[PDB]
């Protein structure tokens, strides 16, 4: 109950934040959310490969 503003700290949530930084990168993301025992875990992969 300690912090005042509570919608979701999307940036304070993440442990490892090393996303592929581009405009055409493709991703996919998996989740496990209980909310009864509290546990939540998220995992997203992203990639890109081009040629010219």
């Amino acid at each position: 109950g300690l912090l005042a503003d509570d919608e979701f700290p999307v940036d304070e949530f993440l442990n490892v934040n090393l996303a592929s930084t581009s405009a055409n990168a493709s991703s996919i993301a998996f989740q496990v959310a209980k909310l009864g025992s509290g546990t939540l875990l998220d995992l997203e992969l992203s990639a890109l490969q081009n040629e010219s």
Binding site: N24, S26, A47, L48, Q49, N50, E51, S52
Partner: protein, 51 residues
């Protein structure tokens, strides 16, 4: 004289492994292709006016 020009461009951006599958790959990639061609020529022809 004259000037001749030609140009060709190709480009692909895809998903690292799926955008190469034989028939399904087209679901995982964008493809771009362009071609141009140009040609210029200059002629001259004189003639003596024989009245």
């Amino acid at each position: 004289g004259g000037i001749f020009q030609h140009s060709i461009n190709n480009s692909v951006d895809k998903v690292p492994l799926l955008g190469d599958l034989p028939v399904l790959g087209a679901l995982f990639r964008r493809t771009y292709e362009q071609m141009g061609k140009s040609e210029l020529l200059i002629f001259v022809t004189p003639k003596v006016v024989i009245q």
